[PDB]
UniProtKB/TrEMBL annotation, chain A:
Assembly behavior: Homotetramer.
Catalyzed reactions per annotation: IMP + NAD(+) + H2O = XMP + NADH + H(+)
Enzyme class: oxidoreductase
Name of protein: Inosine-5'-monophosphate dehydrogenase
Any one of the GO BP annotations: GMP biosynthetic process
UniProt xrefs under Gene3D superfamilies: Aldolase class I
Binding, K(+): G181, G183, C186, E334, S335, H336
Species this protein is from: Bacillus anthracis (anthrax bacterium)
Regulation: Mycophenolic acid (MPA) is a non-competitive inhibitor that prevents formation of the closed enzyme conformation by binding to the same site as the amobile flap. In contrast, mizoribine monophosphate (MZP) is a competitive inhibitor that induces the closed conformation. MPA is a potent inhibitor of mammalian IMPDHs but a poor inhibitor of the bacterial enzymes. MZP is a more potent inhibitor of bacterial IMPDH.
Automatic annotation (TrEMBL), chain D:
Biological process, per Gene Ontology: GMP biosynthetic process; GTP biosynthetic process
Role summary: Catalyzes the conversion of inosine 5'-phosphate (IMP) to xanthosine 5'-phosphate (XMP), the first committed and rate-limiting step in the de novo synthesis of guanine nucleotides, and therefore plays an important role in the regulation of cell growth.
PROSITE patterns per the UniProt record, alphabetical: CBS, IMP_DH_GMP_RED
Positions contributing to XMP binding: S182, C184, D217, G219, G240, S241, Y264, M267
Pathway noted in the entry: Purine metabolism; XMP biosynthesis via de novo pathway; XMP from IMP: step 1/1
Protein name: Inosine-5'-monophosphate dehydrogenase
Presence of the UniProt keyword Oxidoreductase in the record: yes
Record GO terms (molecular function): IMP dehydrogenase activity; metal ion binding; nucleotide binding
């Protein structure tokens, strides 16, 4: 009755996020321009760069999805749209030179209907995107989609534990998306108290997925290009970015001047305005960054430099060999520029 | 023995911002979980919220509106013995609502308690700075002897020893919290306290052996803190600042810099005690929030979402099964929204 | 092959006031009835555990007198001539037989300065140096005990049990603890040296208690609860600089800035203090005007009584031997202060 | 194998602000301690200070002034081969002073070294972002063969394995620091680094088994961080930001908000390299006046720290000094606190 070991273990676990750690440099024979950044998600899915633009109404529509795929990445068309209008976006990406494209779908009554229209437009992956991927409703929906479409790429999320990954994998998902609470615009951890520090979530989830040969997506909480290197080194095959893309020219929306420079709307899909309700995100603005190619060049540039530092010729080597070292707040403050007034902003550091 | 000398600095304590709730398998949607809670057979709440017994939080108006939302209001004691009984009668005659009243450890304790009993109080709150004192113990023992079936809520404590003492004195409910209050300076002027999450857990650990519920009182700033407080062992939470700005709290609206505010002060501040001193609280202001129903709705909404993430169909499952993970300051900064300029405030996040 | 000091370089861990809280315990005693008296030596006993630091912006004659009349002690600083310090000592003693101390450095004329101070009937000399664990201090302690066998000798500053042992065997009957915590101090920034003050107080009290010798917890106390923690860590008495520097009896006058009154407060290792090529170990600043010393002492003694009440301590020896701490994170400290509410009025004990 | 999978998050690292030095018994007065240091028999310094090889820190006037203070300046490599050999010659002509020069791992690296040796350079710094790479190792091995008596400082590194490899390639001094720089963004944009205090200690642990010194390069904001670096194992420290504001640094002064400033930027920044992907930023630091005044405060802090540690010389500090770890609250206790600062101190801003 009172035997319960769960009571004494409540505060046992410990979690790390990007700003808690650094990558330990290692012997390198390979130059950053020489490393390989390709990644294989499935038999039918493979990215030249391990970057995906989030399926949010302020980040990824067709224009973003086309530019992402042209960079070697992938864009997830968001679902705050009609089924008719979302299938229309997917085809536009497909007829534009054989580009890859993904589309977001929820766990709803009309989900399979939406999925039917998406397969008709030749989408390469559907994203079964929910706030709590570790639920029977997601589980049953993955199983439902897999029975009708045995060869369709299914990305299921979001989860943050090894048990949740195993469940989604056994339900039929071929890619698992990791991240509960880390988002730049996300308040889930504050209003519900729920989450796992993102780097520990990647490691714990990839640890389980590794046993099934299934890739993991690190989704959210990435603020600099160095965070992407940590996430890939923590076990994930690919990262999903929201904030770092919302200011790019191809994302939906126009430019507005705020505090003298150009800005674009960036808001969570669980925010009040996006849902038009106890919300789990906010609405905001990120600086305008210009064309997507410039942001992607800096992102890949940081990944190439990071891989050079770790002697990792490809991302698999980085996943299996890279070591981290933990630091305190004083480590983080030493790691950023410090004790100097920054005069010009770098393409890398705002 | 040098046992007390060698153990001075061994203990470690956690507060709300040190931890997150680990997601778990869920078969339940937020709209279907139960938020009801039983403090005693004659004291049952449909929502796990009590409005603090302070002169800027709970009078009759606050107690009635709290009771209609399914919660409980503690009418504060900075008034005459009779006017407190009228407020009690006003609530009881206002639809048979549950209502509580604060009592101190003083000479006129029994007269006031007698007047509250004649008015049909449903619980008295023996409210003191140091619940683990012989004066509290003696008075609880004295009150249980006169009223063997009256609900007695005693506090405040923060150790298993203090909880065990008050339970053996006769209190059916133990209130936990030394120093975490938003307006509180006890830990700064006196150096004394325990981080509230460890305190709730330490006290609940002892209280669980007796089948005695505990209240998490003070330090809750967002709806997610309540989920952690209930997940750490508390049956119900008591809030001061989260309620002080609502329409039903005592006090007119104050106008500051063109906006609406309400006075909020500790019962140990200079201003509250005049109705020389060495205070343990401060005097302040919180923004006006409107009607109580909206704040409760956001609070319950966040709890419901949290229970869904933790797979908790009821609060008992949350108490016995929810697990935490500890995080650094870097983890807390990842948990809030970050690196985006916030445009509009959310109903959930000011 | 033995690499023992090499492998131990980063082993130790230290705590200060903002890292910990005092754990409340069973109490039968009301704050208004606790005893805050403390005995440093047979000839030096204080009714309240408070000493004003020997700095030229904190303690001169008026400050030591108001401190003594409250049951505490004032250390008159040595940034004055020998004659002028002896006159200041004389003024305190001729002002009702009050206790008074005086700071002395390790110099050639230290013995000369000490001769004049003892003649003026000083109650304690404070052998004040930056690095109490040095041969010059020790030999000077040994030299003064030989000439003045019944003289109260306070020696500092130190931060280790070993340093405590050395000064005690040299002959000091009181040891003063604190390397770098001072509000105006930069020793740890410019020199890289120090020990977190709560760890320093506990480590030195661990050694000094074996000899039956008290320690003074000196510096780093910013709020009244910090005094409770330091006494709970083993100190008989605490020494304060900034919390007293703004008081009426402190030397210096009040300046007005932005409508509020301030007083100058500077480290004795600051440029200005050495003025009346230099690598200082302090800075110069201002603290708020606080009015008469009695109000500050009342909040200070009042906060301590509240703390001892929470700890069930009828006397300060009980607090020293029994009080327990719990460690907390930065998030613990943010919860401990007032938070998430706009503070409207200034509290008498919280600014 | 899961061993590497399992060991990803085992290590822990400390930086300057995580620690304090524990005072120890002193029989030595601060003004009598020795701050002389020996990097090699042909390279001996009166003070353990080296000015970084950056285009905003060290040119000829800086290196001459560093040597005259008892230190050393590394002439930066963002100039032509002739322009760098000429500056090395200029320092030598100013009284037989010591001077060092930075070289990259490039095709024309050997050509530049030949000119620096003809100018009688005392040490070359084979300076790279990732010293633990085959290109550096191969470049070090051939330089040791051609110039067997040349002082070779190779960097940068942050692990013992990297230190051991650079020593086996032939370098007599190892330079430690990946990411601690005030103008550095490597750890943010590449995700890679080792907290500078742990990196110095890890590298000094390995180098000392060979009798090889290490230079603690970067991350020093106050003179007490320097005492920590030497107590953590480095023979000498290298500074960029604490030296760029002096009169002798390259360039002139700009006026900002009523005060005087000097440009300070990383060598991996856009401006120094001029699509590029930077690992540094561009900035400004306050003007400080002559080098002698900044050095005086720095060595003064070193003397005080050694005294507190009872270290009569720097060897004793390296072999005996102890640390104690502290949290952010200790660090806040360590700085001035709860007092409004009125006047600027010569060593604390
Ligand atoms: C990205 C975010 C955060 C997000 C994005 C948009 C909207 C939301 C809202 C604010 C609506 N928040 C939740 O929806 N919160 C939530 C919490 C717990 C559970 Cl258990 C839950 O429902 C689960 O059960 C359903 C079937 O299994 C499926 O919807 C699954 O999410 C939902 C969140
Ligand atoms: C909510 C707070 C904090 C509070 C609320 C109102 C007033 C106070 C003030 C500032 C007046 N502070 C105390 O009152 N401080 C205190 C401290 C230690 C002890 Cl030991 C103590 O007395 C205990 O023993 C007595 C006999 O049982 C009983 O009164 C019990 O409080 C009181 C605090
Ligand atoms: C409150 C402070 C910090 C303080 C107060 C006044 C002046 C100073 C200055 C700025 C002058 N700084 C030192 O004086 N720094 C220092 C550092 C190491 C040593 Cl080892 C040292 O000397 C020791 O040895 C002598 C006896 O042999 C004796 O002077 C003793 O302090 C002095 C500091
Ligand atoms: C002070 C800094 C940081 C620095 C200074 C100047 C320029 C750079 C730039 C921005 C150009 N960034 C790199 O250069 N990043 C880098 C990352 C990984 C590797 Cl593996 C790498 O190259 C290694 O392989 C080469 C052959 O040995 C050799 O150059 C060695 O460094 C370079 C950094
Ligand atoms: O409103 C929301 N609440 C919680 N998470 C969200 C919300 N909107 C987007 N997200 C998540 O946050 C990620 C983007 O995070 P970012 O890259 O840190 O800006 C998305 O890919 C989603 O996984
Ligand atoms: O003035 C006081 N000093 C210390 N604690 C107080 C004082 N007044 C109320 N409290 C406690 O602090 C809590 C404040 O709740 P909060 O605003 O939610 O943090 C109250 O519910 C009491 O338990
Ligand atoms: O300039 C100095 N440098 C370092 N420490 C000092 C200096 N002057 C005074 N102190 C110390 O700091 C204490 C006061 O610190 P406070 O009470 O925190 O302001 C004094 O009693 C001395 O121990
Ligand atoms: O642009 C760069 N990126 C990264 N590190 C740099 C760059 N430029 C110089 N450094 C390093 O930073 C050191 C100076 O750092 P500081 O003394 O802390 O400001 C130099 O000695 C180099 O090791
Ligand atoms: K840096
Ligand atoms: K977040
Ligand atoms: K508080
Ligand atoms: K300090």
């Amino acid at each position: 009755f009172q035997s319960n070991a769960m009571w004494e273990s409540k505060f046992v676990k410990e979690g790390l996020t990007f700003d808690d750690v650094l990558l330990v440099p290692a012997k390198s024979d390979v130059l950053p321009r020489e490393v390989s950044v390709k990644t294989v998600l499935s038999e039918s899915l493979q990215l030249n760069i391990p970057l995906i633009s989030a399926g949010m109404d302020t980040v990824t529509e067709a224009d973003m999805a086309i530019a992402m795929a042209r960079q070697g990445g992938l864009g997830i068309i968001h679902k705050n749209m009609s089924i008719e209008q979302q299938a229309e976006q997917v085809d536009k990406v497909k007829r534009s030179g054989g580009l890859l494209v993904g589309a977001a779908v929820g766990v709803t009554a009309d989900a399979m209907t939406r999925i039917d229209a998406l397969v008709k437009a030749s989408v390469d992956a559907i994203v079964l995107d929910t706030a709590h991927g570790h639920s029977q409703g997601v589980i049953d929906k993955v199983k439902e989609v897999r029975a009708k479409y045995p060869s369709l790429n299914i990305i299921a999320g979001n989860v943050a534990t090894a048990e949740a990954t195993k469940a989604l994998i056994e339900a039929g998902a071929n890619v698992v998306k990791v991240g509960i609470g880390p988002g730049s615009i996300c308040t889930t951890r504050v209003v519900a108290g729920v989450g796992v520090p993102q780097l520990t979530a990647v490691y714990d989830c990839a640890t389980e997925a590794r046993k099934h040969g299934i890739p993991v997506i690190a989704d959210g909480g990435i603020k600099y290009s160095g965070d992407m290197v940590k996430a890939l080194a923590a076990g994930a095959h690919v990262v999903m970015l929201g904030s770092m893309f919302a200011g790019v020219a191809e994302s939906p929306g126009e430019t507005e001047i705020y505090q003298g420079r150009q800005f674009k709307v960036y808001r969570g899909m669980g925010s009040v305005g996006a849902m038009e309700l106890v919300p789990e995100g906010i609405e905001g603005r990120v600086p305008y960054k210009g064309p997507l190619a410039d942001t992607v060049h800096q992102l890949v540039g940081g990944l190439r430099a990071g891989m050079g530092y770790c002697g990792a010729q490809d991302l698999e080597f980085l996943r299996e060999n890279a070591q981290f070292i933990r630091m305190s707040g004083a480590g983080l403050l030493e790691s950023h520029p410090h004790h100097v007034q920054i005069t010009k902003e770098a393409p890398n550091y705002s």
